[PDB]
Each structure stands twice: as C-alpha cells, then as structure tokens.
Design an enzyme around this catalytic site. Structure first.
Site, PDB file in Angstrom:
ATOM      1  CG  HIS A   1      -1.916  -1.210   1.118  1.00 58.74           C
ATOM      2  ND1 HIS A   1      -1.465  -2.475   1.470  1.00 58.74           N
ATOM      3  CD2 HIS A   1      -3.217  -1.291   0.754  1.00 58.74           C
ATOM      4  CE1 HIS A   1      -2.502  -3.279   1.305  1.00 58.74           C
ATOM      5  NE2 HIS A   1      -3.581  -2.613   0.883  1.00 58.74           N
ATOM      6  CG  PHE A   2       0.110   3.974  -2.184  1.00 59.02           C
ATOM      7  CD1 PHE A   2       0.109   4.119  -3.568  1.00 59.02           C
ATOM      8  CD2 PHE A   2      -1.099   3.705  -1.546  1.00 59.02           C
ATOM      9  CE1 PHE A   2      -1.081   4.010  -4.300  1.00 59.02           C
ATOM     10  CE2 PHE A   2      -2.288   3.581  -2.280  1.00 59.02           C
ATOM     11  CZ  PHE A   2      -2.270   3.741  -3.650  1.00 59.02           C
ATOM     12  N   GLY A   3       3.837   1.888   0.173  1.00 56.94           N
ATOM     13  CA  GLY A   3       5.040   1.803   0.991  1.00 56.94           C
ATOM     14  C   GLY A   3       5.938   0.638   0.627  1.00 56.94           C
ATOM     15  CE  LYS A   4      11.802  -0.334  -2.045  1.00 56.45           C
ATOM     16  NZ  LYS A   4      12.704  -0.300  -3.231  1.00 56.45           N
ATOM     17  CB  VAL A   5       9.685  -2.756   4.477  1.00 56.31           C
ATOM     18  CG1 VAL A   5      10.585  -2.936   5.693  1.00 56.31           C
ATOM     19  CG2 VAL A   5       8.329  -2.208   4.920  1.00 56.31           C
TER      20      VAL A   5
ATOM     21  CE  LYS B   1       4.889   0.602   5.418  1.00 58.55           C
ATOM     22  NZ  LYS B   1       3.868  -0.159   6.189  1.00 58.55           N
TER      23      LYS B   1
ATOM     24  CG  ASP C   1      -2.585  -5.712   5.727  1.00 64.09           C
ATOM     25  OD1 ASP C   1      -3.217  -6.457   4.968  1.00 64.09           O
ATOM     26  OD2 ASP C   1      -1.429  -5.270   5.464  1.00 64.09           O
TER      27      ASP C   1
HETATM   28  C1  LIG Z   1       9.600 -10.698   3.909  1.00 62.89           C
HETATM   29  O1  LIG Z   1      10.862 -11.348   4.140  1.00 62.89           O
HETATM   30  C2  LIG Z   1      11.676 -10.856   5.127  1.00 62.89           C
HETATM   31  C3  LIG Z   1      11.318  -9.831   5.995  1.00 62.89           C
HETATM   32  C4  LIG Z   1      12.157  -9.481   7.049  1.00 62.89           C
HETATM   33  N1  LIG Z   1      11.788  -8.428   7.917  1.00 62.89           N
HETATM   34  C5  LIG Z   1      10.698  -7.599   7.882  1.00 62.89           C
HETATM   35  N2  LIG Z   1       9.726  -7.622   7.006  1.00 62.89           N
HETATM   36  N3  LIG Z   1       8.933  -6.563   7.370  1.00 62.89           N
HETATM   37  C6  LIG Z   1       7.755  -6.251   6.533  1.00 62.89           C
HETATM   38  C7  LIG Z   1       8.164  -6.088   5.066  1.00 62.89           C
HETATM   39  O2  LIG Z   1       7.050  -5.835   4.179  1.00 62.89           O
HETATM   40  C8  LIG Z   1       6.073  -6.879   4.260  1.00 62.89           C
HETATM   41  C9  LIG Z   1       5.516  -7.038   5.655  1.00 62.89           C
HETATM   42  C10 LIG Z   1       6.651  -7.354   6.643  1.00 62.89           C
HETATM   43  C11 LIG Z   1       6.119  -7.382   8.010  1.00 62.89           C
HETATM   44  N4  LIG Z   1       5.676  -7.428   9.056  1.00 62.89           N
HETATM   45  C12 LIG Z   1       9.379  -5.908   8.453  1.00 62.89           C
HETATM   46  C13 LIG Z   1      10.531  -6.536   8.837  1.00 62.89           C
HETATM   47  C14 LIG Z   1      11.443  -6.217   9.960  1.00 62.89           C
HETATM   48  N5  LIG Z   1      11.055  -5.272  10.802  1.00 62.89           N
HETATM   49  O3  LIG Z   1      12.500  -6.835  10.085  1.00 62.89           O
HETATM   50  C15 LIG Z   1      13.367 -10.140   7.226  1.00 62.89           C
HETATM   51  C16 LIG Z   1      13.739 -11.144   6.351  1.00 62.89           C
HETATM   52  C17 LIG Z   1      12.904 -11.488   5.302  1.00 62.89           C
HETATM   53 CL1  LIG Z   1      13.384 -12.738   4.206  1.00 62.89          CL
END
Ligand SMILES: COc1cc(Nc2nn([C@H]3COCC[C@@H]3C#N)cc2C(N)=O)ccc1Cl
EC number: 2.7.10.2
Length: 294
Positions: free
Chosen positions: A32-36, A55, A143
């Site tokens: 939703h318009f965001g990337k982490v 984010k 969500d």
């Molecule tokens: C999706 O695969 C990975 C994600 C992480 N870490 C994270 N993912 N997220 C968000 C990323 O966007 C999708 C929702 C997720 C949620 N909640 C936050 C973190 C974090 N604070 O560390 C670490 C390793 C892998 Cl392989």
C-alpha cells in the site's frame, strides 16, 4: 565585525537517523504505497552499524505514512515490532528493529521440524496478546495476515506492519474505509467486504484466517486465497468479491488444516461467525489456547 548566531543547546536525538548514514542493503517487502528495506545505519562508515528495517513511500500518501509512524511510535508491547525512529529529508522514513527471520510466510516453510503444534499455539497466543493490546488502544489493524507477523525467535513473534491501522472513534464500534482498491479480501470479514466497515471483531475474523495459515506452515498451495479460489472459481475477475461474499453467506469456511485437532479448529470457527457480535474475543481465544497448552 560580522554578527553570527550563538550556538545553543544541541542534545542528540537517539530516534533521529541521518539520511547520509542510512545505507540500503536489500528490499524486504512492499504494501500500500510503501516499501520496506533492510538498511545498515552506519555513522562510522565501516559496516559495523546496526541493521534496521526502513519503511518509505514508493515514488501524496505521505499523510498515511506519518499516521502509521505516529501509531507505531506509541505502541509498546512484547509482540509488537519496535519503533526505532525516523529519517526526515516533507519526506520521511520509518525506522524499525530488523528481525532477520522474516515473517511467518518465510519462516514457517523452512522450520516445520522445529515448530510443532505446541509452538504454533504459543505463537497464536502471542498474536492475540499483541492484537488485544492494539484493540485496547482503540485501533483496528485491518491487515492481520501471516505476512505481517514477524519471527523474533523460535519462541517469539511480533506484529510487524501497521500500514492499514485505523483508530476507531470513542463510543463508535467501527471504522468506515474509503481506499479499498488493494484490500486483502480473503482475510476479510463479510462486513468489510460488503460495507467496507471495520470492527475489532473484523480483526478476530482475520486472526482466524492467520491461525489457519500458521497451522498450514504458510504453504502457498493451501493459502486462504488458493483455498477460497478453489471454492468459488479463479476466473471471475471483478466478480470475485461478490462470489466470495455469497460463499460466506451460504456458511462455507476454510476447511480444517491437515493434522489440526478439532479443539483448535473449533476455536478458529468461533472467529468466523457471520455477525461480528457473535464472534469470540481475543481474550477468549487466549483462554482457549492456554487451556490446550496446559
Ligand atoms: C519478507 O521477508 C523478510 C522480511 C524481514 N523483515 C521484515 N519484514 N517486514 C515487513 C516487510 O514488508 C512486508 C511485511 C513485513 C512485516 N511485518 C518488516 C521486517 C522487519 N522489521 O524486520 C526479514 C527477512 C525477510 Cl526474508
């Protein structure tokens, strides 16, 4: 002589991350318009700095990000990802602790051998405690899915994304949403699908679907989307949501996960009462799971 400004108080803010020291490593996710992204905050420039999850906006939804930042900054719970700070350019980036194990989506398929029913029920209790904490702050998550549940360790999970989180007005029971184009419809209660209304009980419904994913070790072939698309048909396009509403109205639900005992499946079915008022609460789920644990 030239008149300059006297240098005043300059107390360093531990929650202020300087853009120049925030070095991108890899993408973690989108939504939703965001990337982490995974970044290293490296002020000493030698690769020794702390790893952080960042984010940011995908290059007008700045207001939504600021609202998410303000929600997370004020949530303090063992099962909620830790806010670390911000990086400000009008632009802003949300800095969070980095959990290397990822979400239940990444972790469960790779660790089935280590994660038995007892451990799955302990993760279910922790998700319920984080969610009950959020509800007590008068928020609706909107969500709740395994992709948004992070693994801190084999023994601990944290809710890790609050991108869709909304405040429920005092003495009101729900939030009416307007932007619904990218809704996770296969995790949504009927009231969310039909009237775009979100109650705390709507998160209980979503929890039931998340528990189903947890019990199936997040196997893609038995995902709630894959299962509901087998039930209603996968080639309905724009008619998918009405077909889903119709199926739920008929009383059809996700089946019992393989190897899931009936006692656990019954707690899951209680999340899926058609009427929000008939659904179980997070507190009663915690009681139910704890009873099965001891
Ligand atoms: C999706 O695969 C990975 C994600 C992480 N870490 C994270 N993912 N997220 C968000 C990323 O966007 C999708 C929702 C997720 C949620 N909640 C936050 C973190 C974090 N604070 O560390 C670490 C390793 C892998 Cl392989």
């Amino acid at each position: 002589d030239i008149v300059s400004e006297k240098k005043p108080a300059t107390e360093v803010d531990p929650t202020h991350f300087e853009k120049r020291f925030l070095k991108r490593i890899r993408d973690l996710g989108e939504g939703h318009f965001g990337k982490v992204e995974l970044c290293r905050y490296d002020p000493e420039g030698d690769n020794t700095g702390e790893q952080v999850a960042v984010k940011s906006l995908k290059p007008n939804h700045i207001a939504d990000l600021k609202k998410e930042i303000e929600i997370l900054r004020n949530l303090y719970h063992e099962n909620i990802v830790k806010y670390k700070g911000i990086c400000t350019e009008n632009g802003i980036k949300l800095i969070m602790e980095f959990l290397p194990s990822g979400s239940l989506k990444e972790y469960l398929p790779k660790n089935k051998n280590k994660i038995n029913l007892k451990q799955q029920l302990k993760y279910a209790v922790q998700i319920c405690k984080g969610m009950d904490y959020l509800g007590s702050r008068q928020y609706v998550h909107r969500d709740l899915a395994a992709r948004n549940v992070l693994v801190e360790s084999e023994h601990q999970v944290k809710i890790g994304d609050f991108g869709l989180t909304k405040a429920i007005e005092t003495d009101k029971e729900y939030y009416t949403v307007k932007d619904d184009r990218d809704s996770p419809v296969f995790w949504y209660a009927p009231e969310c699908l039909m009237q775009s209304k979100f109650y705390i009980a709507s998160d209980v419904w979503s929890f039931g679907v998340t528990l189903h994913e947890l019990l199936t070790y997040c196997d893609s072939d038995s995902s709630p989307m894959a299962l509901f698309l087998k039930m209603i048909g996968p080639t309905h396009g724009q008619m998918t949501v009405t077909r889903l509403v119709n199926t739920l109205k008929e009383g059809k639900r996700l089946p019992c996960p393989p190897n899931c005992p009936d006692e656990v499946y019954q707690l899951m079915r209680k999340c899926w009462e058609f009427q929000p008022s008939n659904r179980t609460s997070f507190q009663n789920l915690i009681e139910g799971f704890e009873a099965l644990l001891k």
